[PDB]
Amino acid sequence: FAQECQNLEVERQRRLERIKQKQSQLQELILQQIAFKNLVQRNRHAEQQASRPPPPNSVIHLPFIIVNTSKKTVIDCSISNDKFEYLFNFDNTFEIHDDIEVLKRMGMACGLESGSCSAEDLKMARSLVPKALEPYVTEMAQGTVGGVF
Amino acid sequence: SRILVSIGESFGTSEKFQKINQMVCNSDRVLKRSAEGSNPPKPL
Amino acid sequence: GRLEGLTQDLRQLQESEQQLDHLMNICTTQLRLLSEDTDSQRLAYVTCQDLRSIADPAEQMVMVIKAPPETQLQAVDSSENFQISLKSKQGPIDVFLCPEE
């Protein structure tokens, strides 16, 4: 049934690609869940310790984006009337980072991005995720996420 | 030499930002800006 | 034979994906609850000291962009310079620096 077998095998490969994409998405969503919840509890606790919430200007709410370049790098800004459109010119390398990426580098995801968890990091991570997602977190902690189940 | 992304994609953004960072990190053939020969914007 | 082999594979992959979808479902529901939660939103912020450990406003310049959802960001490598373009189809976009420099 070689003809039918060809049809099943492309279907199989098509599903293998969907699963692979979904596994990455699942991971990322778990890391966001952990990171957001971790940030929120860091701030909740820091607002107890010496009361008075932080001054508005010293604080950036999510979502946001970061752009960094050398302090020397010439930047040319152009803005539309309504501030809907912007254009920046750079005379040197710059970097763009997401808030999630910032949160990860702050250690909000408990090192889970790269399996770099201490016992306490992992415990923290496990407690910020519902029980059903625990086994997957364990998978992420070991790097044994692939093999494509 | 042209990467587009939407601020509203929980997937891809970071990796596409990192491809953006990849595209933009090597700066051998980049012209440096000169104060003379340019007409600076009106400081409002 | 191989036709049963592929059919058995298709069944494993169907069950696996059902499970994956379920977990993703649980996961995006957690994120939805977080986004509907007023107290969490109020507390979902970073300080200037936070942005430091990942790039401090002492040697490097740091720029914060806050565009509404759906807005487009174009990064360009020209023959001779670099550029970022932001186009928001609805709502204004906000840009600012960090205090320490």
UniProtKB/Swiss-Prot annotation, chain A:
Q: Where is this region: Dimerization?
A: 7-80
- Give the tissue specificity: Highest levels in muscle. Also expressed in brain, placenta, liver and kidney. Lower levels in lung and pancreas. Not detected in heart.
Q: Which cysteines are joined by disulfide bonds?
A: none
Q: Where is this protein localized, as stated in its record?
A: Nucleus; Cytoplasm
How does it get modified after it is made?
Answer: Phosphorylation by E2F1-bound cyclin A-CDK2, in the S phase, inhibits E2F-mediated DNA binding and transactivation. Ubiquitinated by the BCR(KBTBD5) complex, leading to its subsequent degradation.
The segment annotated DCB2 runs over 62-118
Q: Segment DCB1: which positions? A: 17-49
Induction (free text):
Down-regulated during differentiation.
Q: What quaternary structure, including any partners, is listed in this protein's UniProt entry?
A: Component of the E2F:DP transcription factor complex. Forms heterodimers with E2F family members. The complex can interact with hypophosphorylated retinoblastoma protein RB1 and related proteins (RBL1 and RBL2) that inhibit the E2F transactivation domain. This repression involves recruitment of histone deacetylase (HDAC). During the cell cycle, from mid-to-late G1 phase, RB family members become phosphorylated, detach from the DRTF1/E2F complex to render E2F transcriptionally active.
Q: Which family does it belong to?
A: Belongs to the E2F/DP family.
The protein here is known as: Transcription factor Dp-1
What organism is the protein native to?
Answer: Homo sapiens (Human)
Entire protein: shown range: 199 to 346 of 410
From Swiss-Prot, chain B:
Q: Identify the tissues in which this protein is expressed.
A: Expressed in the retina. Expressed in foreskin keratinocytes (at protein level).
Give the subcellular location.
Nucleus; Cytoplasm
| Residues where N6-methyllysine is found | 32
- Domain of life according to the entry: Eukaryota
Posttranslational mods = Dephosphorylated at the late M phase. SV40 large T antigen, HPV E7 and adenovirus E1A bind to the underphosphorylated, active form of pRb. N-terminus is methylated by METTL11A/NTM1. Monomethylation at Lys-32 by SMYD2 promotes interaction with L3MBTL1.
Question: Phosphoserine: which positions carry it?
Answer: 27
Residues bearing Phosphothreonine? 13
According to the entry, the disease involved is: Childhood cancer retinoblastoma: Congenital malignant tumor that arises from the nuclear layers of the retina. It occurs in about 1:20'000 live births and represents about 2% of childhood malignancies. It is bilateral in about 30% of cases. Although most RB appear sporadically, about 20% are transmitted as an autosomal dominant trait with incomplete penetrance. The diagnosis is usually made before the age of 2 years when strabismus or a gray to yellow reflex from pupil ('cat eye') is investigated. Bladder cancer: A malignancy originating in tissues of the urinary bladder. It often presents with multiple tumors appearing at different times and at different sites in the bladder. Most bladder cancers are transitional cell carcinomas that begin in cells that normally make up the inner lining of the bladder. Other types of bladder cancer include squamous cell carcinoma (cancer that begins in thin, flat cells) and adenocarcinoma (cancer that begins in cells that make and release mucus and other fluids). Bladder cancer is a complex disorder with both genetic and environmental influences.
Q: Which family does it belong to?
A: Belongs to the retinoblastoma protein (RB) family.
> Can you name this protein?
Retinoblastoma-associated protein
Classification from the root reads:
Eukaryota, Metazoa, Chordata, Craniata, Vertebrata
Protein's gene: RB1
Query: Complete protein: which residues are present?
Result: 829 to 872 of 928
From Swiss-Prot, chain C:
- Which superkingdom? Eukaryota
In its record, the post-translational modification comment is:
Phosphorylated by CDK2 and cyclin A-CDK2 in the S-phase. Ubiquitinated via 'Lys-63'-linked ubiquitin, leading to its degradation. Deubiquitinated by USP11 following phosphorylation by GSK3B, promoting its stability.
Q: Where in the cell is it found?
A: Nucleus
**For the region Dimerization, what residue ranges are annotated?**
1-84
Q: What assembly does the database describe for this protein?
A: Component of the DRTF1/E2F transcription factor complex. Forms heterodimers with DP family members. The E2F1 complex binds specifically hypophosphorylated RB1, the interaction represses E2F1-driven transcription. During the cell cycle, RB1 becomes phosphorylated in mid-to-late G1 phase, detaches from the DRTF1/E2F complex, rendering E2F transcriptionally active. Viral oncoproteins, notably E1A, T-antigen and HPV E7, are capable of sequestering RB1, thus releasing the active complex. (Microbial infection) Interacts with human cytomegalovirus/HHV-5 protein UL123.
| Protein task | Transcription activator that binds DNA cooperatively with DP proteins through the E2 recognition site, 5'-TTTC[CG]CGC-3' found in the promoter region of a number of genes whose products are involved in cell cycle regulation or in DNA replication. The DRTF1/E2F complex functions in the control of cell-cycle progression from G1 to S phase. E2F1 binds preferentially RB1 in a cell-cycle dependent manner. It can mediate both cell proliferation and TP53/p53-dependent apoptosis. Blocks adipocyte differentiation by binding to specific promoters repressing CEBPA binding to its target gene promoters.
**Family listed:** Belongs to the E2F/DP family.
Question: In its UniProt entry, what is this protein called?
Answer: Transcription factor E2F1
Q: Which organism is it from?
A: Homo sapiens
